[PDB]
Amino acid sequence: TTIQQNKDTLSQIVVFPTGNYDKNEANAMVNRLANIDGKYLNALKQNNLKIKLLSGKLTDEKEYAYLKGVVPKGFEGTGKTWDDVPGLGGSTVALRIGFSNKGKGHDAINLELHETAHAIDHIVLNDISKSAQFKQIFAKEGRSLGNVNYLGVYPEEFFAESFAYYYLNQDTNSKLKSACPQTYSFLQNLAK
Template sequence: MRTIKKILLSFLLIPAVLLSPMTAVANETSVSPYLMDMIDVRLSENSEENETHVNNIISRLNRIDQRILENVSQSGVTIILSDLPMTEFPEFSNLKGVVPRGHTDTWDNIPGLGGFQSYVRVGASEPGIKNNHGDVNLELHEFGHIVDSFLVDGMTISNEEEFVQIHAEEYEKMFPGQPYFKYVEEYFAESFAYYYLSQDTRNILSSRAPKTAAFLENMHRKVFTITDVKSDGFSLSWDDYSGEYYNVIVNGSVVHRTQDLTAVVDGLEPSTLYEVAVEVRDKNDNVIDKTYVESIYTTAKANVETDRLSALLVEVGKVPESNITPELREAKKEAASILQRIVNEDISQEEVDDATANLSDAYQIFQPRIMEKNIQGEENTFTSETSHVKTMPKHMTWIVILSVSVVLILLAIVYLYYSGREED
């Protein structure tokens, strides 16, 4: 009887074995699905401390406005959360042993990096020498860089004239005696972190840099979300703005007027690039505000799926020509050619898929913005221990877990069987 009880107890442990890797993901049902689409957790061990850190990171990022999370998610950004050095992952292996500009440490010890593939060191959220950065919060600062580069296709927000002027006026007031924030992109990212970290930090931002705070408060209303892109049109939605009505503008012309927060645009040409914006007007027909302009490719009319290629090509189009790599330039040229030829030529789905894969590979290798984390004027002495833990693709994780669990269960059953015989 004791043997049977032991075997039953072993089976009761199966759910705990199988579910333990998932505890590193925030358990809140209210976490934005768009945020979770971007998160890639890669821990060397599922310790309680690591899981707490990961859940806290996700909880803080979840404070960001939903519209911003949705649009950034559509760009295809991935945020790797790990307790391992970034250079242990294939996405950043080319940075191993490289010392970033202005640093004494190599990238192996840098806790954060922003780009199409992003990284945040688990357990390093707080500023300090130990964590090797001076940001008010690491993950929100890094996400600020991501928003700057990927919220609006074809645009870096901090380079827009409106924010450049705000930066020139307020960065010294917000961060006196800190020359690092002369860089407008660093000022944007750190201000973003202050805005979303807590009410206290938001109050500090509002007090010292009111125009910056107002800019960030309104940012989610400056963008719209594109869905259901077809050969002759698309759907779009935006957040509420206190106005009388909205105009949807395509290539400079008003094509739709509505009091709703959604619209459907049709009658467009297939495989064509369009510039789209939404403006809000008051009851006197005066323009109150206008969203950023987004570039949208309509799909091919033929029975070929081009949505992913079109969206990726728009995103790659934002890379300055002076910074683009030869591989990315060639892949971009090939993708544009496919979309242009598909209208009048017989282009296969395989050709479209190949062009998409080539462009995606070239873009992931190219890091449009390598974020450099450091504490100004202080030498970074923190050194991570070298880890030999090998990572694996996410889709392989469950296969490995199940395989190991089955083997352990079988061994436990055999052991308990013979132990029971000895007791009998």
């Protein structure tokens, strides 16, 4: 079945953390990633993207020390830095176990799907969220999921959040279709 094939793909790219952690929650994160269309997961594997699950802060990892003490875009005036952010996506994917849900230090409906979407956008699709077509859709629909000063201002964040809505569950998929029909259609066409 497609679920088992996606888990097979994920078994080759997911890096579980050193040390001890909530193993059931880490498994739950993998099971949510397995709902992403296999085409995208296998394209990430082709590009040697590692999905790193972490048991500590993002900036405890050597490869993210360049973010120590830096304020992410949109976090200005909050006193928070990347040290306090539970997930990152783009050229890499890093995810703190236990912080999946909205409000756990981040605004996404689901951390792992949002961050992995960034990697798909950047690594696989050459920053499609900043392509002319998506910029047009973002200009009309980019505020319709709320968070208008973040999703509505950064097309790469609107893309990642829409992707997460599309793939998390049937409730979020239907909410995206109602709120952002052109974005939904774009994602339908992207998967074909």
